[PDB]
Curated annotation (Swiss-Prot), chain A:
The chain holds residues 24 to 92 of 92 of the full protein. It comes from Homo sapiens. Disulfide bonds join 11-35, 12-51. This is C-C motif chemokine 4.
Amino acid sequence: APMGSDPPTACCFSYTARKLPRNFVVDYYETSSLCSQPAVVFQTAASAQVCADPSESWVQEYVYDLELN
Amino acid sequence: MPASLQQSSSSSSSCTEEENKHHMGIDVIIKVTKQDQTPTNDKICQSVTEITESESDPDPEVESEDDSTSVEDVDPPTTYYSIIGGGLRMNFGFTKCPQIKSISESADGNTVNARLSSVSPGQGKDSPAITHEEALAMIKDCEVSIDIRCSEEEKDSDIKTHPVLGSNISHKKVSYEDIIGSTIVDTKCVKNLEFSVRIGDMCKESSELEVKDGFKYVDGSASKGATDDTSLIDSTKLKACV
């Protein structure tokens, strides 16, 4: 299964200014590494995916919470 | 065309006369460039599905008949659209931003456009009016979301011979405000993707209530830069996808 040449990438370029309460956040996923400026991406209910700067503790706590339950 | 019974105060009829009031509207631009490898597909306006978390349409809001302490609500939920077309799917998701009743798309070469915005007074749809305080507040919280992917729906297009309703707002250069939130794109089906936004009175600019934002994605190259997005795309080739 020869790996692809140099697959583009899917890293965040901007973060949302509004923190969507847990109720509208059932899952999440992390960007990548091929970008020297990654971040955490959270899923919702009526949208899809939205980047989030991990610089905010609330984002770190939201991830930690999703890690348990 | 029949009938004629119709007032004139209705914001849908014409602009208001309340000095301290101006119908604020949103208008985003999207110039997507396909990669030189993605099959051909100019069947824009494939379809669109509006959704609103909790806001729905009546008045349930999840229907949480059990108080205790939680009060996260406060701010209104979010509204997103799944406008499929051009062999791609551009997912929206605005929050605390003027309602969007205008949706159109077009295909030219290996690129495809998409204009989402609100309607200007005297058009045929609503046009909620608000004060300067409520406006200045919105322009601050208003945050858009984007997440384009790669579609393959060869289904036909569903357009309407009805001209595209504009917000009467231009895309010139004005004050800068961070509106565009997250912007994830699977380059696997999009080489370059430009974005431009601008919220302001759709009746008569007011400078203060006028702002804008926009980036420039070109083969992985992203860069912020305010510029005259007045011609970013031919608004004359836009067709309503209804």
